[PDB]
Amino acid sequence: MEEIEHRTVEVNGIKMHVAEKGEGPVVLFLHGFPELWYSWRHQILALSSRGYRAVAPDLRGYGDTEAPVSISSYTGFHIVGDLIALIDLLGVDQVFLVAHDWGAIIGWYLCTFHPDRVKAYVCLSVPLLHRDPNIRTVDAMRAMYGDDYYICRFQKPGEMEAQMAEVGTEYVLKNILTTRKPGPPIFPKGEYGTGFNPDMPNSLPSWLTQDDLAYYVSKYEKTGFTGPLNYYRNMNLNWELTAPWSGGKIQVPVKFITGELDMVYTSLNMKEYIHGGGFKQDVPNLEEVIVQKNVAHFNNQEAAEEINNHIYDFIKKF
Amino acid sequence: MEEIEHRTVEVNGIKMHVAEKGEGPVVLFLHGFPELWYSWRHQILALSSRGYRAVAPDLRGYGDTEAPVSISSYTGFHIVGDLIALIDLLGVDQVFLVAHDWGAIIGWYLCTFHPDRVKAYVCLSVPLLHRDPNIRTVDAMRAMYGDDYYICRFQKPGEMEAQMAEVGTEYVLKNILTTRKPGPPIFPKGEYGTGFNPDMPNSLPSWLTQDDLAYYVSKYEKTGFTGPLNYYRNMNLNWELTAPWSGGKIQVPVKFITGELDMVYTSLNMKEYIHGGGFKQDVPNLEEVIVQKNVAHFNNQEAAEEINNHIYDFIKKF
Amino acid sequence: MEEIEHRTVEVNGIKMHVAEKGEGPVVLFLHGFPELWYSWRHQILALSSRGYRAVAPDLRGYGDTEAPVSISSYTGFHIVGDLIALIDLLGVDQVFLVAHDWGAIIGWYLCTFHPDRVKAYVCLSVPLLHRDPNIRTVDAMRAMYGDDYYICRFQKPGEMEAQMAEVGTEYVLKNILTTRKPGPPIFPKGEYGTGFNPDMPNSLPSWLTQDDLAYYVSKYEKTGFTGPLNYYRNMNLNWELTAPWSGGKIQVPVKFITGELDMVYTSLNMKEYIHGGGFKQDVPNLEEVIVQKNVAHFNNQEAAEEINNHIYDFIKKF
16 A cells, blocks of 8 residues: 555646556546545555556545535536546556446546547446436436435535534445445435435444545545535536437447445436446447445445456456 | 248157248247247247248147157257257258247257357347256255245156146146246145236236237147156256266357346346356356346247347347 | 244143244244244244244243233243143154244253254354352342343333333334344333433334334233243242253254344353353354344344344254
8 A cells, every 4th residue: 555656746727636556558447426546445456466557546626636616617527627638647548447436427428528548448336327318317316216315415505515514524434335225315304314324334344444434534524525526516517518429329348347235226227227228228348247246336345356356357358 | 920831840850840931041949938939929020021031940849849758858968959950951050049948048058069050149038057066956946945946846747737737728828928926936835826926917918919828728738738847857967967068168149138027037046147247257258138127037929029129130240 | 924824722731822834844933022923024934935844932921822920930941841842742853943032041941951852053142041050140130230220120020011001012112122222221210211222213224114013012012011021030030940950061053143232242241151161161062153243132133134044054954
């Protein structure tokens, strides 16, 4: 871990924290919510020792990366803009892409805008967001799960920040990271709860030490949740602005991996999209879908070694 | 339908009924239990009109094909023996393979012994039976679900024939063809009763006409069930005899398609095998898995047009 | 649940409700306080499926089993008297033994008086009550935790009953069943109050359904708590009468399994007995201790499937 290099770079008008290790073809990791570059610690060290340069930034609004002030600075276009500028800084034409959760949505955008710059993509948790021309992203979510669906509850500016502050930062992080409840996260009215996890464990699972937890906590105490929450607040705008890619396909080779208990996999008709043919239709070079038994949302941490091999076994084919 | 040609051929020392229509590369269809060539009727008509020669035999012991007397005449080697002799009579080096249920197991054996004779394989319902070197096929089923699991109950000679004879042939065929109940079929002690289906309609689903059922019934009224049942009675022997191929891989390109409600998909940890990596490991050129929403076991009949397109879009790439 | 047989049998001069399903070697389940045969619902269905005869009575004083009027009818001897008469009616020489809480204490007496009739023992929550020749059971408890310790509070006849009548039976059952509080249950001075759970959830844990709680409530609204409380009111008498087995060992194979948050595990120095050598000293064929993380007292219900596998994997060896 002490061997991981840390630097700040200037990309797309912002300052970004970039963690890296190794030499070789770039493997670019994009973390999700509410995570950090640190979520990729095991993969950084693993792929580093296999002849690749591992590169994991904090995304815009996260950790030690600058958090622009206005909510409108968090469209997928801004965030891909940072990454394209980063890849140019790395001085390579193509990267291998590995991404998870919100990082995977951003990953999909990157593949949409610039498939030429991604050799292959290991996508965790979140399949491509199929753009339905008849209904906006968040609208479809609300129609299915109502106002207390977490993504709906994440919309109103300031409100979730306030609810999270009531229960405190450490509680929010522990609540989310340790959750194993499948299905749509629905919050209790007017407050946090018991947000994502009504059965919070006494002890932390073996994959998440208390030090690990402390790392996240120290970073989120500094930054708060507004930057990260702003990605969600732009989902309908993202839907609008991506009209040019309506009905299109992604030709980048893809390996998809989710935990069986991941709330993403177990909601939003995601199974039908993944296994029914839709996913393969949108993503013609999707080579393989893997469902990990008794693994939940944070599969790169909970199933770290399997994810390491799955990444290497795929990217070596190129 | 009356434009389909029907003939008897001599193959591997038996007389086999072959249904055929069209000219072009052979697409060879293999029905399962408790079915007939007739299950493929929509596929026969659809594929023959797309520039292919559709060939659907009744297998050994079914329909208008000879039924040997001995239980030991129904190992997978006997049945592939018939089919290899048949492909030879057709005068072709390769076939496209399409199969379902017991037909699919036989299709796997065919791809195991002569992958060269098979261009591509559309496999319905039943994935490769991975040979566990430590445990026999039927023993593993008994261990998981006990003696009343249907395949266990199918073992003792004469018993299921008798039990079926008491409820009647039509009832058996209707009971089985109409079922939509997921999970392992467990029979009631000492009788046929209701399983496979505790919730018979009894109005037939739209995909199965009373004329369809009548045709099935007239064949099984003639043949009884012993021939078909004997396939299951050789599963442990098939396991023993295939020791030369343990740890083997199948290199034939495969497209796997199952109804979501199929009892095969929803038992025996088949989901773990299909989605976990086991299937793709054994079958490296497994290009795609499709799980059909709200469709049960008999997917080629229930989702005919869907299946027709799925077959066509696959085999046209070769 | 409906395939479960329920009969009344005459054992040891009392009428006993017995719940039964499946066939094969007998597996006998002994429930604790304040439970029922119904606590074993998942284990009954699971194990009768794998070819065992699952048998689970309501113990004396519980549910639909007769409840003798006198306190003196509730020694361990009376209850093992019941169980031996039962195993005789079952017509086997040995049974497999699974027990939890007070049932486990009785089960220990059974193993003490007749190890010949027990092939192996799966013990949940309560280890062997070591007979300290120097001090009676409740005396030691009272020395350690004072008069408001729950077992001491259960001694004076009529008192806990009345405190439970105020506050009502549904509260008592929910309060006890939902508790996850480790350590010694210590009651408020003159009433039930919060007793067992100072922090009761508004919502049942996922393992307990409203139908579940209603079942318990129903029987306990009919029977009351006297019968079950009477077991505690004979702990000292049991200590006296077991003088003949002072210093003895127990040779029955035992698998012990506790939730790490069980009040039993986290009080009365149970940890030092279980892991310190003492439990192994008293029970030489104790194969392993299984502490289940993030599980509380009622482990057969909270980790139902996991315990199904634990039982099965153990009684396999025998």
